[PDB]
Amino acid sequence: MSKKVTKEDVLNALKNVIDFELGLDVVSLGLVYDIQIDDQNNVKVLMTMTTPMCPLAGMILSDAEEAIKKIEGVNNVEVELTFDPPWTPERMSPELREKFGV
């Protein structure tokens, strides 16, 4: 547009970040619930993890945020961590439900 980031870009930016445990990106894992961007390019996301575990959780949070702040428009970054709801293991490719055993 001019200086107006969108959820479309935020997803496609996040497709870069791959969790060294899993070997897929967060859009592949389908994690991301909401994505809203204000007129002030406050990129806000309701992204969550699968589990409150991970192998290096904090680093993975910061890696998603890394891709998000690399959008060159992304003035501010309102990364919530909504851990309350049950994510969904079938969000991944169906090939990987076969692979992992879901």
From TrEMBL:
It comes from the Bacteria. SUPFAM superfamilies: Fe-S cluster assembly (FSCA) domain-like. InterPro entries: Fe-S_Maturation_MIP18 (IPR052339), FSCA_dom_sf (IPR034904), MIP18-like (IPR002744). Transmembrane segments: none annotated. Residues 7-79 form the MIP18 family-like domain. It holds the Pfam family FeS_assembly_P. This is MIP18 family-like domain-containing protein. It comes from Thermotoga maritima (strain ATCC 43589 / DSM 3109 / JCM 10099 / NBRC 100826 / MSB8). The lineage of its organism: Bacteria, Thermotogati, Thermotogota, Thermotogae, Thermotogales.
